Structure formats: C-alpha cells, structure tokens
C-alpha cells in the first residue's frame, strides 16, 4: 500500500529548564526547580558564585 | 486512490510553503518549529458530502 | 548632615582583572552600596558578543568542514567567547579569512576601525589540510545581559539565509565582582569605610565606566522613590 517514504531528521538541541531530572551518582535524585540569577546565587569572599 | 506529495497543499498561504521546496519537501538547514510544513501530502477523499 | 563617597585609587592589574576603592561612606553604606553595586554589575551592564555567523560552505550548525579538526558547533562555541569592543556602531559585521595549516586565531580576522579585539590569541578553529580555505561572517552588536538563539526566532520576519548560524550572545562584560568593606581614616572622622569592589571583565569595558553606569542606573530606578 505504501508508494514512497520521506524521512525528515530534526536535530533538536534542549538545554535545561525546570523539571529535568538530574542526580549525582550516590543515588541523590532531584528536578531543578528555579533557574535563577548570577546575582542572586550564594558567593563567596572571593565574589565567585555557585 | 494514490497520495501525492506536491508542494501545492490546500489553505495554506504562500508563506507556509516558503520552507518547502518545489517537490514538497523542506530544506536541508532549515530551522524549524512546531507546525512547521515538514513534507506537504494530500491525500484523496472525493465526493464529499457537505 | 551626610558624608557623600568619591572614587579614588583604581588599581588595575591584569586587562581582566581590576581593584577599585570608594573611600569617604558612611558606616552601613559600604555594604549597602557594595552589595546592591554587585547586584547591578554582574546583570544589567552594555557590552558586544557575536550574534550571528555565515560560514561560506556550511549549511548549519551540524555539518562538517573537511580540513577543520572542530564541529561547526564547536567553532561557533569559540565565536561566543570573542571579545571585541566596538567604538561608534551598534551592530558591525567582520569578515575572517586564512588558509594553511595554522590554528585561526582571532588576530586573523579582518580589523575595522571602529573594532578592537582583546585577545588576539583566541582560538576560533584550527586548519589541518595544506589548501584549506576558510572565509566567514561574524556578526558582533552590543547588547545587555544574556539573549540566547532561542528567542530570536521570533520576530525573524525572513531570516531564511539557510547559512546563518545563530549563536548564543552572553552580553556581560561583567565576569566576577567581589566587595570587602574594611575601615577607613581620613584624618578626623572617628569611623568611616573604604569600599573596594574587585572585578574580573572580558576587556571590552574598562571598570571605571563600568561603574559608573553601575550607578547611573542606580540612581535612574530611584527617580521612582523620589516621589510617587
């Protein structure tokens, strides 16, 4: 029944965003739940972020 | 019937089928999003009892 | 009744790196100011990426070049962390050709007047083969905080060039900003503070303006308090 075929192929690049699962390797699960400024983020005397 | 896979696709407006090619089908590196014209089919359904 | 601060010694070593003092505030106001004047450097300070990019041969960012040991992407990676400082234009486009077998530096590319690259050392990509040609056009405007690819696709309104890769645009000149508020003597003032703010740029921005749009903004959003 099929006459022809046309395969498109997408190359979707996703970066992170909230809901991504994300987990170390000590069983530490856990899904991002803000995405949040440099500025708002805990620094350190020496004015480096985390 | 056969289903084709023409470039002319009923309502839809000439910059729809702008990414289309003239057989129908998309260029290679063309950046898509959703709903975006992919391969334009049509499919035949005759008397249409309106 | 309130002592105002100036801005005295601005120790600069590294092009990146800077060590600026504000001598005559108050006690609280090395803190209020350093603080709130991180809050401003590290987000909302003018500074030029490169927006978008046309390589001669490729069609998108997921090709490859036969005699360029990077991937496209990996090239427009490089692109990304070009620092160009431009004088009097908005938006300016370069144009970058070399062939042979030498890494592609950004020293190769074409210089404008208006157009000063910081690190002529950069690597934009390598060339394997002997006759290996390159040519692009990369595309540098200025522009505030970080505007990804993803949402330029918007407005488009016939941005078809199939060949115009878009890239990421990471606008801040700001790297890293750090404030320690110590004392400070200025012959008789029983206790004043001396606030040093240390920051790290991409050298596009020197740091005395940087701060001083720091606080140009700063006092602008106030305008909304000086009354209601």
């Given at each position: 029944g099929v006459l022809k075929i046309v395969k498109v192929y997408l190359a979707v690049k996703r970066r992170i965003q909230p809901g991504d699962k994300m987990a170390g390797r000590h069983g530490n699960k856990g899904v991002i739940s803000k995405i949040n400024p440099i500025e708002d983020m805990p620094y350190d005397e020496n004015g480096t972020p985390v | 019937g056969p289903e084709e896979i023409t470039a002319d696709i009923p309502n839809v407006g000439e910059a729809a089928l702008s990414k289309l090619d003239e057989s129908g089908i998309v260029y290679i590196g063309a950046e898509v999003t959703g709903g975006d014209i992919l391969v334009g089919k049509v499919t035949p359904k005759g008397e249409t009892q309106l | 009744e309130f002592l105002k601060p100036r801005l005295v010694d601005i120790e600069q070593v590294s092009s990146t790196h800077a060590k600026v003092t504000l001598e005559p505030l108050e006690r609280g106001f090395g803190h209020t100011l350093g603080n709130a004047l991180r809050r401003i450097l590290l987000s909302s300070m003018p500074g030029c990426a490169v927006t978008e990019v046309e390589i001669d041969g490729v069609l998108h960012e997921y090709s490859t070049k036969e005699?360029?040991?990077?991937?496209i992407l990996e090239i427009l990676l490089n692109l990304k962390g070009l620092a160009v400082r431009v004088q009097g234009k908005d938006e300016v486009i370069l144009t970058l050709n070399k062939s042979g077998i030498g890494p592609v530096t950004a020293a190769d590319i074409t210089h404008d007047g208006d157009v000063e690259i910081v690190?002529?050392?950069?690597?934009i990509c390598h060339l394997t083969d002997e006759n290996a040609s390159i040519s692009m056009r990369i595309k540098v405007q200025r522009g505030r905080g970080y505007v990804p690819a993803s949402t330029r696709i918007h407005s488009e309104e016939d941005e078809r060039p199939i060949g115009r890769l878009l890239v990421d645009a990471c606008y801040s000149p700001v790297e890293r900003i750090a404030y320690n508020v110590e004392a400070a003597r200025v012959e008789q003032r029983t206790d004043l503070d001396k606030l040093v703010i240390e920051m790290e740029t991409?050298?596009?921005?020197?740091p005395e303006e940087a701060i001083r749009r720091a606080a140009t903004i700063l006092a602008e959003q106030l305008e909304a308090f000086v009354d209601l």
């Open positions: - | - | 005699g360029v040991q990077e991937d690190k002529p050392q950069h690597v991409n050298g596009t921005i020197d």
